[PDB]
Amino acid sequence: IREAFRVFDKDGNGYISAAELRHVMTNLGEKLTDEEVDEMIREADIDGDGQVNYEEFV
Amino acid sequence: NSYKMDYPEMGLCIIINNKDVDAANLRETFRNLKYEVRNKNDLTREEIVELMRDVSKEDHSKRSSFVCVLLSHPVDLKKITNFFRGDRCRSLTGKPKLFIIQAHKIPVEADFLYAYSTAPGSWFIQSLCAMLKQYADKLEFMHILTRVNRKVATEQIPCIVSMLTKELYFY
Amino acid sequence: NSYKMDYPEMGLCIIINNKNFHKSTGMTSRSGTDVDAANLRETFRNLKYEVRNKNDLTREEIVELMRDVSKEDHSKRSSFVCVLLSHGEEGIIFGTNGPVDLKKITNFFRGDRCRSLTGKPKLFIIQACRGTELDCGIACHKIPVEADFLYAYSTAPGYYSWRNSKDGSWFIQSLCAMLKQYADKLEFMHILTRVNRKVATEFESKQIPCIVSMLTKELYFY
Amino acid sequence: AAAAGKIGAFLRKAVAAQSYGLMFANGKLFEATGDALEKRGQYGFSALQRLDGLSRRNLAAVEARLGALDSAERGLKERIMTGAWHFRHQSNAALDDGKTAAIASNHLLARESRSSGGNTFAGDKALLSNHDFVFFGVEFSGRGKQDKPLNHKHSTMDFGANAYVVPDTLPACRHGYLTLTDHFFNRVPGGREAEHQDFVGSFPQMGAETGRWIHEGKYRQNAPIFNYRDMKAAVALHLIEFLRDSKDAAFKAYVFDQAMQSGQALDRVLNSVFQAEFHIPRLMATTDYAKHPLRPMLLKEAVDSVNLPALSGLVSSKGDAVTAMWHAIDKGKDAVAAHLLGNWRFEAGDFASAPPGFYHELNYALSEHGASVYILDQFLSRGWAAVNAPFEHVNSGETMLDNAVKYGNREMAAALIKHGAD
Numbered sequence: 037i038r039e040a041f042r043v044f045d046k047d048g049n050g051y052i053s054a055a056e057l058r059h060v061m062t063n064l065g066e067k068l069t070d071e072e073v074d075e076m077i078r079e080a081d082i083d084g085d086g087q088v089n090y091e092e093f094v
Numbered sequence: 095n096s097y098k099m100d101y102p103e104m105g106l107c108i109i110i111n112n113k114d115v116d117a118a119n120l121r122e123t124f125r126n127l128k129y130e131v132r133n134k135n136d137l138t139r140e141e142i143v144e145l146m147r148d149v150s151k152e153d154h155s156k157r158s159s160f161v162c163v164l165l166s167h168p169v170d171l172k173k174i175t176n177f178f179r180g181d182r183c184r185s186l187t188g189k190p191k192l193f194i195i196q197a198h199k200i201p202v203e204a205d206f207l208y209a210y211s212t213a214p215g216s217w218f219i220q221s222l223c224a225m226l227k228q229y230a231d232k233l234e235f236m237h238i239l240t241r242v243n244r245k246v247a248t249e250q251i252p253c254i255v256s257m258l259t260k261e262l263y264f265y
Numbered sequence: 266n267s268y269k270m271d272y273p274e275m276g277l278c279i280i281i282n283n284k285n286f287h288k289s290t291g292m293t294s295r296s297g298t299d300v301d302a303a304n305l306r307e308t309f310r311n312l313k314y315e316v317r318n319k320n321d322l323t324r325e326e327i328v329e330l331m332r333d334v335s336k337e338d339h340s341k342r343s344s345f346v347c348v349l350l351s352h353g354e355e356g357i358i359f360g361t362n363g364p365v366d367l368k369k370i371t372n373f374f375r376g377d378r379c380r381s382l383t384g385k386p387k388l389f390i391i392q393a394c395r396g397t398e399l400d401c402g403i404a405c406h407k408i409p410v411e412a413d414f415l416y417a418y419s420t421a422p423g424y425y426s427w428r429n430s431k432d433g434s435w436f437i438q439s440l441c442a443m444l445k446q447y448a449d450k451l452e453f454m455h456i457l458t459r460v461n462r463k464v465a466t467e468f469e470s471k472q473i474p475c476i477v478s479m480l481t482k483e484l485y486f487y
Numbered sequence: 488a489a490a491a492g493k494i495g496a497f498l499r500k501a502v503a504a505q506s507y508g509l510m511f512a513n514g515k516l517f518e519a520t521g522d523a524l525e526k527r528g529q530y531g532f533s534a535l536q537r538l539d540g541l542s543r544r545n546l547a548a549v550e551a552r553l554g555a556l557d558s559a560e561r562g563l564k565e566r567i568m569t570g571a572w573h574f575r576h577q578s579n580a581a582l583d584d585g586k587t588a589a590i591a592s593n594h595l596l597a598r599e600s601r602s603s604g605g606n607t608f609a610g611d612k613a614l615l616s617n618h619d620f621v622f623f624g625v626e627f628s629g630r631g632k633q634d635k636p637l638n639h640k641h642s643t644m645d646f647g648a649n650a651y652v653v654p655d656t657l658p659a660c661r662h663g664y665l666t667l668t669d670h671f672f673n674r675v676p677g678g679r680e681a682e683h684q685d686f687v688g689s690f691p692q693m694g695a696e697t698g699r700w701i702h703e704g705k706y707r708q709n710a711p712i713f714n715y716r717d718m719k720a721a722v723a724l725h726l727i728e729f730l731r732d733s734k735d736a737a738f739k740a741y742v743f744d745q746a747m748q749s750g751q752a753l754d755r756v757l758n759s760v761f762q763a764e765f766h767i768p769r770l771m772a773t774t775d776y777a778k779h780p781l782r783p784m785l786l787k788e789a790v791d792s793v794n795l796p797a798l799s800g801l802v803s804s805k806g807d808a809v810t811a812m813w814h815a816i817d818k819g820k821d822a823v824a825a826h827l828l829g830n831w832r833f834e835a836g837d838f839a840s841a842p843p844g845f846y847h848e849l850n851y852a853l854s855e856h857g858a859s860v861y862i863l864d865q866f867l868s869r870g871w872a873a874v875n876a877p878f879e880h881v882n883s884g885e886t887m888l889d890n891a892v893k894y895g896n897r898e899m900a901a902a903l904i905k906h907g908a909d
């Protein structure tokens with residue numbers, strides 16, 4: 037319900053939160069495929085930047 | 095190729111008149127073809143429906159085909175004919191159902207044939223009876239009926255609507 | 266009697282194929298119709314006819330084309346054939362932009378309005394269809410009349426189909442097969458009865474072609 | 488760390504929510520039934536709980552209407568609810584990409600990232616709008632990925648010549664929904680139409696009923712859909728309710744004789760009673776899969792699916808190079824045309840007559856409805872076509888500009904009046 041907020045330990049608060057760093061982090065550890073990561077980041081936030089930990093899917 | 099007309103009974107014929115000599119001629123020529131005619135004079139504008147309903151629910155297992163002459167001058171033709179689309183008349187499935195009419199919208203069924211004419215006995219009926227008397231053991235029903243068309247045109251013109259899937263010979 | 270089909274040239278053939286309707290009407294694409302048009306072209310070209318293929322004509326173009334052919338000189342020709350492949354309703358055919366009545370099409374070919382075509386066969390073949398695209402969850406013919414007109418309707422696209430691209434329509438290809446096989450020893454009415462026997466009976470899991478005939482003689486293509 | 492294992496799942500669910508939001512907000516069966524949603528552009532997680540509720544109700548509507556599964560039906564249920572499932576794609580395009588598969592939906596493959604291929608039709612985006620899903624066919628054999636799958640056609644049709652088999656344990660399958668038949672074609676193929684006639688013919692009574700029986704006949708088009716959790720029990724329950732209605736010797740002699748060998752004896756029971764479908768939401772990207780060449784691929788399929796390596800393998804002379812060029816003239820494949828022009832040296836007389844199988848002359852083919860402006864421009868610039876030559880066999884007396892104006896193609900009309908007075 038709110039643990040997804042605390043998941044974002046890379047606290048880029050009130051900004052793009054280093055979307056490139058998120059791209060790097062996603063495809064290591066769990067071995068995500070690049071064509072999946074691109075869709076992930078595209079649907080993360082449209083129009084460039086400013087997800088600011090929205091988590092407004094709930 | 096052709097239909098089958100070697101059943102124990104050739105079929106049933108219903109000649110409905112609405113008010114004469116043409117009806118008598120039709121009775122004679124169809125009894126000549128080993129039919130079973132049931133001539134009915136002027137009926138009520140609704141009486142025909144239950145007349146067809148009574149003959150719709152029968153046992154035509156030994157009957158080759160069905161003929162319903164409608165020699166008249168109003169009830170919708172949709173409900174008169176719809177009793178016979180196989181599902182209702184399980185006995186009459188895969189066998190010809192002829193509807194000769196003299197007095198356009200058309201219902202589309204599996205093995206139905208129609209033959210209309212115009213009010214101005216009658217030249218259409220006289221030509222039909224003469225052609226059936228002359229050619230009944232040689233020509234198909236289509237050729238006989240187009241000869242009727244030629245005769246009527248030489249002396250309007252009848253129109254033929256056919257859904258039959260096989261040829262028809264009265265022998 | 267027969268229709269005396271031994272003139273120098275054997276009639277004239279017109280094929281009208283409508284496949285890409287105007288977006289205003291909101292109609293489907295009618296896939297796999299060029300195969301039907303080519304099949305009909307070859308079938309009637311083998312019968313010594315003069316085929317004219319016309320594809321995607323508007324409502325006002327079909328009438329102009331028909332009026333242009335009714336004013337020709339068919340004195341050396343035996344008959345006249347016209348084929349229509351499009352959408353439609355119980356008694357009307359569709360152009361690319363708007364429906365056009367069928368009665369007005371054949372008035373140019375009346376006995377008195379066309380002196381060159383009298384006592385001669387005039388064949389009209391209609392393949393009309395209408396999809397049940399009611400996206401929420403899913404019976405007559407106004408027929409003209411004259412002495413030497415024959416109509417062959419088929420208002421059915423089939424009871425069902427799979428995702429395979431259609432190879433035409435069972436009606437048209439069956440008609441072409443019977444014309445190729447039997448149309449040198451059988452009359453046209455018998456050929457049409459065999460087409461009725463094939464279609465909607467061997468295609469059982471629904472409509473069936475209706476053959477409206479006013480011909481006063483018998484038609485032998487040879 | 489571990490937060491990377493949760494953000495990935497969160498983003499996967501968020502992405503999967505949009506292919507369900509599109510289907511539920513758009514489409515019209517879901518407001519003709521009571522399942523529709525409000526259009527939002529960026530749907531939330533409310534597009535997944537709706538699917539969960541729909542699957543729960545669909546499972547209940549059979550589980551609570553059946554009996555009690557006295558002593559034998561539970562074994563059949565357990566052989567199915569504990570089996571191994573693999574999904575088969577069979578496309579004609581190039582997807583292996585060396586060591587990672589990537590299969591995309593229509594709504595993504597045509598999302599301004601233009602490509603070629605597809606087998607969708609009209610209405611699919613109107614009734615359902617499921618054009619944003621990746622479709623698969625289920626296989627209940629249980630044998631591994633490195634095998635030969637024993638099915639080729641889904642309903643009656645071969646979708647391709649390369650089967651891409653994946654196991655049902657992928658993290659991507661967790662948000663895919665099942666349907667016991669084709670979603671748009673609710674019918675089940677006939678017993679005579681069903682594949683492996685050598686099996687059904689052994690039981691001439693079994694195949695007499697599995698030919699027309701649609702599902703959810705309350706609308707003749709509505710179909711029941713089950714999520715990942717409820718997909719395994721639903722197929723077993725529907726199989727049992729079908730069996731307790733069929734009157735055959737299979738019911739006692741074979742369906743309880745397949746227990747020890749759940750290979751062909753189950754993959755031919757379940758793929759004959761039903762024809763299952765799996766729909767993965769947006770993209771199937773993974774490193775564990777299997778590519779099996781079922782049959783060789785034709786020129787038409789390689790051209791239509793712009794399989795450039797396969798096309799170059801198939802084309803070995805010029806007699807088929809011109810055939811491939813005609814195939815690309817149709818269907819408007821610009822990449823195929825460029826590839827063929829970069830390798831072969833064509834002549835103006837090569838396109839002077841339509842090869843067999845093609846119904847139109849050069850100018851009509853170049854100017855028709857779904858024509859390509861790149862190919863037309865190249866032909867006009869290389870002198871392989873005459874801009875002012877009129878048609879002779881179809882619409883005689885008309886020119887290519889007549890097609891350009893007639894079909895309302897401004898780009899093609901402008902290209903046509905650049906190379907000739909017209």
Ligand SMILES: NC(=O)c1cccnc1
Pocket residue numbers: 575576577578621622623624641646647764
């Ligand atoms: N994409 C496909 O080939 C496919 C497989 C099974 C069902 N529908 C589509």
